Design an enzyme around this catalytic site. Structure first.
Site, PDB file in Angstrom:
ATOM      1  CE  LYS A 158      -3.943  -2.135   2.318  1.00 42.18           C
ATOM      2  NZ  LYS A 158      -4.831  -2.096   3.509  1.00 42.18           N
ATOM      3  N   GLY A 218      -8.823   3.336  -0.059  1.00 38.87           N
ATOM      4  CA  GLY A 218     -10.039   3.447  -0.839  1.00 38.87           C
ATOM      5  C   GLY A 218     -10.161   2.350  -1.874  1.00 38.87           C
TER       6      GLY A 218
END
Lengths: 220, 49, 230, 204, 239, 169, 248
Positions: free
Chosen positions: A33, A47
């Site tokens: 991430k 998201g």
């Protein structure tokens, strides 16, 4: 999903987790991430996963186009202006929640970007589903101008509070340390969760499955 | 230009104060008389491949 | 002469305005490029008209990606257009394929850009030839485009003024196997063939390809390299 | 849903020096089957396959659009395609229809063209890549396929036991599904050869 | 000889083209000369004015043009092509701040100017703006700079700068000037910037006939000198 | 093992600097199956350096020209073409050192039956120039002129004569 | 005169710009394809074989285009790269539409309609490129086709290029075979034709190129055969000259 960032006395420490889910089923036990932007700037994504991936590669391509044409080191305020101007044009349809951090000539800078185009310069931010748990660790234990290992201990503590909340992780706590000269990136920094051993015999036999038709095709 | 071979081969013996003409005198005279256009830079050639 | 234009043929031969565009290439600054066994060396000539010109302002050896560099011999103002074209074109491969573009792939596409200005009928062709280097998949490469749109694959070559003297130098000089350090030694020694009087750390400007990526040399090494090494 | 209109199940699994892929054979509308020979695994070069599952329109559509772009890639370059390169190619094709998306979830399995290194990945319906080291699954009966692979998978497996593990994983999970079945085909590839086998499954 | 490509912008046989290099002698109808000098941490523009009428004003004559708060310039060549060149310079200086969020470098601006002058040479059917531009500005960790843009699309940054009619005479003075290692303490800069133009033009000007723009690393704002302090530097060199 | 292998080259350098010939010439007789142990292409530099440091010592010519002829007959039976042609070029130079009268010319004629037929070029410029010495040494002026002129047109196609240019000039 | 754009016509009445392009290909390379039962071949010539080049592609005249077709090229190289990238892009559009390969004739007419269209619309040059075609289909098997700058084409059994090697067409008729058209009988014919037309004697292997196309187990392999087996093909023909002089 739980991402967080902080600004200590010399640089910026980022943190994230390693789970992506589909519905209420864990799809991935090890997902990255923390995304590359420039050799001084990194960005954490939250998201919609494909919206954050295709956005963070376009702007990183433009800054490589920009700095190589310019001939010097990029600025964090340039990547701030490109993201909030792009996401405002899509009217919030692209769901991307980003934490932007890097060290310029002017010093370290930390931002938080919302998918409609609103940006905030803050000394510490949390985004994601477990951002409520990680933020309570900051406000209890943040103090300005911390040291290196003091700031690294705070982030790994704050991410782990979201891991033991729901939508946590198949935990591999990630850290990216950005300083004025040294750059660190640690994928297996902390493994608090282990899978137990398998105590059963599952001896698959060589021929315990009926085959209707076989076919052999050699190669070279 | 066969004459040009015959004159330049005998010319090699003149600068040696010699009247004898060998086969080596002709083979040096072939490369002297025969030449080429020597089209340089090759970009003209590969524009026109 | 028939010529006067680009959208018609001559009754006997070929397009004449592209041949006149190659005349501006030969009247440019000299350059050299040598492909060694472990890397490719680019070297060019760069003299100011006066003592007033800042040498560290505008560069000749220009990186495209982290493993691809590029020089020229022609007009610098036309050079800056297709450099900026080749930058944005190299990023379009990386957004699709997520992989650094091989050196044989730009030259498919950069020559197709220089193709398009040879069309009809109110535009002019470029007056710039190029030399493109890079070390992709182990083996290094050294190519050369032209304003007509063709391309090559060189072992060693030289463009600019007095290229025929540098070519007959390199024909007598270039062997098959040397290191990169011996390659720069014969790349300045061919620049000394057609250069002007003084050759300092600011008259030349040299970039190299390793397998560790593309790099251009700072004048600290280039002073220490030209220090009595022939 | 739209994904549950035709059914499907595609599984890939990584072995020691080899990789396997399997799918079902049933084609049909919501409760009525049509045929039992619907292809869902397509060869894209040697030692590199792809599996598709979801809406049966987009299965046949994307497999032709990807074949359109692969042959143009393998002619501008004399080399073949790397397995990382195809994953970036498919993710570009799905993201162009960001708001008109194709209803499929691709599964890519294959070996390295130079070395023997296997590769497995799966994507979402809008192009999120996800590489693993053990297995990837896609289709309607996904939750049954996680229950079989988490208990039967071993790290370093010969092509004998790798075939027997992916066989028992596909048979026991698809028989729990209602809209999938009617035959299972299994491809198992390696450096030397390619083996295709069909299994004896319940035809109800 | 040529003859050949002397109407439109195509090539000559061996090897040049003439319509661009006719714009280089299109500066000289201005009848003017400008000098820029960078010696040390400051930067000086100097340019004379020529007022041929008493009915003509004084304020609407100045060729010193403020591009941004830290970047100033001077224009030579013909007058009408010069001001439209400045309108592009003021415009794209603000696009950098909008797109990228910080002040544009003086080095980056001449790239954006010369590329616009490049298309008019490459693509035809527009007259290529026969004027010349000189820039000054302060850069962080780089000091002050002086740049020149050309009508052909060429640019190069350099220390002592002349333009207008008398390049080859003023630059010949400045080569012999900038060869000794003297320091440039903000009045060594100005006095050489005056006396170079004062001897090449041979005017040694009266105080009300010039302009002087300046920038310094103590106040990086672009600054046009007052007529009173122009007299102060003029009485300084002639003690 | 290899620390003794280069110690043979190190002690052989001590055999050359301290000035003893039968021990150094005995070492050059000793390393001849040891030559069949390393890179055969770059072994010619090892043969050249040991031969040059042998011949730079002292005029003991009963071993000088004889161990040269031993290495020639060895290359008849070992068949390295580049080494034996390099040994003959040193030998005809050794013939000139005492002015051995016609066999220097007889050897140089037999090298030109080989060398200009071959592809290597830098050894031709040596043997063309060395004959132009000995035709001038035997007071034949125009034949030494023609041998020098053939040496000039041969010397126009070499990477570097970095020292041989001044030898030619 | 009438040496303006391609529009217009000349009086009496023809097209001078098209004729100028159709004469330009004679000063170019040399390509030829031959007859073959159960196969087809191409042969080309390496121009400017100077010793400071790499040839990293090892295929310059020949471009494999769909899966079972390739093509030679002759003419302006700037227009050559435009056509080959266009022609490969035709065959994949057909394959996306029908899921079947293009049957080797209407691929040629698809290009020939593009090559024609620059002769009527102003103001463009015509393509100064002629090129060959080899291929296999379901309907007729092995085929040969010949492009022109005007967009005209035509099938052939043996053909070549003009002012460079127009005398080879006289040799192809004088040494013509029909029926006895195996590949080895045709490769021996190929090295004999390139012997006279390429005026450099003894035919070094680095100056030529040979590409074949056979039909094997329903796969249609395409061979660009390497330089090692060119050597034993040349020395076979050099042996046949020493055998042919026994009649003398």
């Amino acid at each position: 999903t739980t991402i967080a960032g902080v600004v200590y006395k010399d640089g910026i420490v980022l943190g994230a987790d390693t789970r992506a889910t589909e519905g209420m089923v864990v799809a991935d036990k090890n997902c990255s991430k923390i995304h590359f932007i420039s050799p001084n700037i990194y960005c954490c994504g939250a998201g919609t996963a494909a919206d954050t991936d295709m956005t963070t590669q376009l702007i990183s391509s433009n800054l490589e186009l920009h700095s190589l044409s310019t001939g010097r080191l990029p600025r964090v305020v340039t990547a701030n202006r490109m993201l909030k101007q792009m996401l405002f044009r899509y009217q919030g349809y692209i769901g991307a929640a980003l934490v932007l951090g890097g060290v310029d000539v002017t010093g370290p800078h930390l931002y938080s970007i919302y998918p409609h185009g609103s940006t905030d310069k803050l000394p510490y931010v949390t985004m994601g589903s477990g951002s409520l748990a990680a933020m309570a660790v900051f406000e209890d234990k943040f103090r300005p101008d911390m040291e290196e290992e003091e700031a690294k201990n705070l982030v790994s503590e704050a991410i782990a509070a979201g891991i033991f909340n729901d939508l946590g992780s198949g935990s591999n706590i990630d850290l990216c340390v950005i300083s004025k000269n040294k750059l660190d990136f640690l994928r297996p920094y902390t493994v608090p969760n282990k899978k137990g051993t398998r105590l059963g015999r599952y001896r698959c036999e060589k021929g315990t499955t009926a085959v209707l038709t076989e076919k052999i095709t050699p190669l070279e | 230009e066969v004459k040009g071979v015959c004159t330049e081969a005998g010319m090699y013996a003149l600068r040696e104060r010699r009247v004898h003409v060998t086969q080596e005198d002709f083979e040096m005279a072939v490369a002297k008389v025969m030449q080429k256009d020597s089209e340089k830079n090759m970009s003209i050639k590969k524009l026109w491949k | 002469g028939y010529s006067f234009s680009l959208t018609t043929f001559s009754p006997s031969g070929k397009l004449v305005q592209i041949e006149y565009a190659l005349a501006a290439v030969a009247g440019g600054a000299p350059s050299v490029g040598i492909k060694a066994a472990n890397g490719v060396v680019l070297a060019t000539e760069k003299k100011q008209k006066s003592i007033l010109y800042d040498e560290r302002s505008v560069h000749k050896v220009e990186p495209i990606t982290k493993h691809i560099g590029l020089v020229y011999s022609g007009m610098g103002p036309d050079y800056r257009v297709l450099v900026h074209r080749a930058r944005k074109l190299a990023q379009q491969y990386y957004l699709v394929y997520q992989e650094p573009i091989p050196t044989a792939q730009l030259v498919q596409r950069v020559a197709s850009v220089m193709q398009e200005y040879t069309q009809s009928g109110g535009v002019r062709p470029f007056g710039v030839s190029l030399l493109i280097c890079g070390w992709n998949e182990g083996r290094p490469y050294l190519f050369q485009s032209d304003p007509s749109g063709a391309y090559f694959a060189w072992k060693a070559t030289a463009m600019g003024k007095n290229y025929v003297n540098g070519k007959t130098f390199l024909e007598k000089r270039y062997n098959e196997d040397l290191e990169l350090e011996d390659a720069i030694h014969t790349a300045i020694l061919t620049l000394k063939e057609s250069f002007e009087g003084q050759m300092t750390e600011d008259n030349i400007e040299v970039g190299i390809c390793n397998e560790a990526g593309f790099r251009r040399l700072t004048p600290t090494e280039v002073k220490d390299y030209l220090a009595a090494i022939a | 849903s739209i994904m549950s209109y035709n059914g499907g199940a595609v599984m890939a699994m990584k072995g020691k020096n080899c990789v396997a892929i399997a799918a079902d054979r049933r084609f049909g509308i919501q409760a009525q089957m049509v045929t039992t020979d619907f292809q869902k695994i397509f060869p894209m070069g040697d030692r590199l396959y792809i599996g598709l599952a979801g809406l049966a329109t987009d299965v046949q559509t994307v497999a032709q659009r990807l074949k359109f772009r692969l042959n143009l890639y393998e002619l501008k370059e004399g080399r073949q395609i790397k397995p990382y390169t195809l994953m970036s190619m498919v993710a570009n094709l799905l993201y162009e229809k960001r708001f008109g998306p194709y209803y499929t979830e691709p599964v890519i399995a294959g070996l390295d063209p130079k070395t023997f290194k296997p590769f497995i990945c799966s994507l979402d319906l809008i192009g999120c890549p996800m590489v693993t080291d053990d297995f990837v699954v896609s289709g309607t009966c996904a939750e049954q396929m996680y229950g079989m692979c988490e208990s039967l998978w071993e790290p370093n497996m010969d092509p004998d036991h790798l075939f027997e593990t992916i066989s028992q994983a596909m048979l026991n999970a698809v028989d729990r599904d209602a809209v999938s079945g009617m035959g299972v085909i299994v491809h198992i590839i390696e450096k030397d050869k390619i083996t295709t086998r069909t299994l004896k499954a319940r035809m109800d | 000889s040529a003859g050949f490509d002397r109407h439109i912008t195509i090539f000559s046989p061996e090897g040049r083209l003439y319509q661009v290099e006719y714009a280089f002698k299109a500066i000289n109808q201005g009848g003017l000369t400008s000098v820029a000098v960078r010696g040390k941490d400051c930067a000086v523009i100097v340019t004379q004015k020529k007022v041929p009428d008493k009915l003509l004003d004084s304020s609407t004559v100045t060729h010193l043009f403020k591009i941004t708060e830290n970047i100033g310039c001077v224009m030579t060549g013909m007058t009408a092509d010069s001001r439209s060149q400045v309108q592009r310079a003021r415009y794209e200086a603000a696009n950098w701040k909008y797109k990228y969020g910080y002040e544009i470098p003086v080095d980056m601006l001449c790239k954006r100017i010369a590329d616009i002058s490049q298309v008019y040479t490459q693509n035809a059917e527009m007259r290529p703006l026969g004027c010349c531009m000189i820039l000054i500005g302060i850069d962080e960790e780089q000091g002050p700079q002086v740049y020149k843009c050309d009508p052909a699309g060429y640019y190069c940054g350099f220390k002592a700068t002349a333009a207008g009619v008398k390049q080859t005479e003023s630059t010949s003075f400045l080569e012999k000037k900038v060869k000794k290692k003297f320091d440039w303490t903000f009045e060594q800069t100005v006095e050489t910037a005056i006396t170079c133009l004062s001897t090449v033009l041979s005017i040694d000007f009266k105080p009300s006939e010039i302009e002087v723009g300046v920038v310094t690393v103590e106040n990086p704002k672009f600054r046009i000198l007052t007529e009173a302090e122009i007299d102060a530097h003029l009485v300084a060199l002639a003690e | 093992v290899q620390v003794k292998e280069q110690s043979i080259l190190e002690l052989g350098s001590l055999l050359a600097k301290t000035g003893q010939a039968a021990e150094l010439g005995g070492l050059l007789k000793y390393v001849r199956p040891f030559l069949n142990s390393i890179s055969k292409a770059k072994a010619a530099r090892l043969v050249r350096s040991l031969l040059d440091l042998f011949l730079d010592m002292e005029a003991a010519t009963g071993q000088e020209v004889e161990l040269c002829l031993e290495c020639i007959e060895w290359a008849k039976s070992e068949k390295r073409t580049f080494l034996r042609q390099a040994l003959e070029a040193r030998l005809v130079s050794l013939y000139f050192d005492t002015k051995r009268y016609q066999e220097a010319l007889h050897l140089g004629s037999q090298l030109l039956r080989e060398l200009k037929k071959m592809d290597d070029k830098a050894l031709l410029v040596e043997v063309q120039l060395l004959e132009s010495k000995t035709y001038h040494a035997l007071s034949n002026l125009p034949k030494a002129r023609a041998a020098l002129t053939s040496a000039r047109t041969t010397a126009n196609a070499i990477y570097c004569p970095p020292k041989l240019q001044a030898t030619l000039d | 005169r009438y040496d303006s754009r391609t529009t217009i016509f000349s009086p009496e009445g023809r097209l001078y710009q098209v004729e100028y392009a159709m004469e330009a290909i004679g000063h170019a390379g040399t390509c030829l394809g031959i007859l073959a039962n159960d196969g087809v071949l191409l042969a080309a010539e390496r121009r400017n074989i100077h010793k400071l080049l790499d040839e990293v592609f090892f295929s310059e005249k020949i471009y494999k285009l769909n899966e079972d077709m390739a093509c030679s090229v002759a003419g302006i190289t700037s227009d050559a790269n435009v056509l080959t990238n266009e022609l490969r892009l035709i065959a994949q559009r057909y394959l996306l539409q029908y899921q079947e390969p293009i049957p080797c004739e209407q691929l040629v007419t698809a290009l020939c309609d593009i090559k024609q269209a620059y002769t009527q619309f102003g103001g463009k040059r015509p393509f100064g490129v002629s090129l060959l075609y080899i291929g296999w289909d379901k309907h007729y098997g092995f085929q040969l086709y010949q492009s022109d700058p005007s967009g005209n084409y035509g099938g052939w059994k043996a053909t070549c290029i003009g002012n460079n090697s127009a005398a080879a067409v006289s040799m192809l008729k004088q040494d013509y075979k029909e029926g006895e058209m195996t590949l080895k009988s045709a490769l021996a014919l190929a090295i004999k034709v390139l012997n006279k037309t390429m005026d450099v004697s003894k035919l070094s292997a680095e100056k030529v190129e040979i590409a074949t196309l056979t039909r094997e187990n329903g796969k249609t392999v395409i061979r660009v055969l390497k330089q090692k087996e060119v050597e034993q093909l040349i020395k076979k023909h050099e042996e046949e000259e020493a055998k042919a002089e026994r009649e003398k």
